[PDB]
Design a protein around this ligand. Sequence first.
Ligand SMILES: Nc1ncnc2c1ncn2[C@@H]1O[C@H](COP(=O)(O)OP(=O)(O)NP(=O)(O)O)[C@@H](O)[C@H]1O
Length: 424
Amino acid sequence: DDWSKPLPPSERLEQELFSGIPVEATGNNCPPHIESFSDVEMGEIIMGNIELTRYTRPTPVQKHAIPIIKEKRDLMACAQTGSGKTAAFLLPILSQIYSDGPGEALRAMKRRKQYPISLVLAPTRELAVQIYEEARKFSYRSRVRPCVVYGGADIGQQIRDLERGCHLLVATPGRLVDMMERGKIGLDFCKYLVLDEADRMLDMGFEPQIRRIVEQDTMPPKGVRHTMMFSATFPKEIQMLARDFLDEYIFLAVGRVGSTSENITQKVVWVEESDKRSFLLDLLNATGKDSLTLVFVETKKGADSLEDFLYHEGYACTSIHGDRSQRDREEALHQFRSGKSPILVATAVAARGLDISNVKHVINFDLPSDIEEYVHRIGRTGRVGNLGLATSFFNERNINITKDLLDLLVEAKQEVPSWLENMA
Ligand SMILES: Nc1ncnc2c1ncn2[C@@H]1O[C@H](COP(=O)(O)OP(=O)(O)NP(=O)(O)O)[C@@H](O)[C@H]1O
């Protein structure tokens, strides 16, 4: 049929969905930015819903982003959160899908295995749900049916949610890979790809999964598909990712991009191995007892030992490791956001692809051997809006990383221990 004409409204539905500065651009032929949602005939379903959704003027991001996207041009955008980046890609993407129609491929087959027209990859359940909920707002009265899947939840209901129809898919990388291997999702006709919060997805170690999804499967190559990345920070691993996934794109930054962090306090202390346990105890005693704490250690043997130690000195802690049985799983995780056990001891490898959310204090009991992993770990601080904290224990075992750590601290505008320079 037709995908520009709105469907009959449902009043049951609207009450559900609808509860009441410099900018830099870098690249060829970047189409001029925009006044108001009115320039570019998005189409009725969009502004129909735009007025429903309280949006009055697009956001600074939404405004350099939405036209670039509508003009079939890849982009790499940097913006702090609360900047309205979600609607920035959802609005124009969905607008196109409404105008162009499902597409001859899908049509030619109109259950079970689904082929999404658009794939949005998100780091966490919380953000994935967020994107999903606004997708519903802007797909209301359309024949586009969005879905969301994520880890740390029953896959059975998700699978069945998929089989009801899925044109726009929001997903955490680990769960999407699970769906593909199960034959539930195919990317053969995916025409729009979005990596929201890319830097964080890399911090949690989703890169192998993301490269499985994009590069190693049936997903249309760049130039054919339209690809968009949104990232707070812009590390080198991220510009390499943009190099590999994007095609002659436009670069956007509203506030100027910090290389990393900006909402984490960073504190390095010299602590001999002999003293780490006592030092940790002091750190924890100063913790706002409700605040969640993540403790990284090097080996599993070390993770079980420390956690054992903490539990007997009477702390509510849990461990995630791999001498551990696989479904103690989220049980450890699930106790973490519960506040039942505000201290989680873990190895970096055992925390790969785990949505360890709302962590206020990250403690590197042991430091990794490269600065890139160090960036990954302190990346587990939670919210944007609220300053987070990263304390690292350092000694002679960590000599190799002084200069990298020193440069990072300087570029992050953090206090530099006066002995650290002397070590380099
Ligand atoms: N043009 C707009 N006018 C008013 N409010 C808006 C506009 N665009 C988005 N918002 C609201 O701003 C809030 C935060 O923006 P959102 O759509 O979540 O993107 P975002 O916050 O930049 N991405 P993230 O920070 O990771 O959550 C939401 O409640 C949106 O409904």
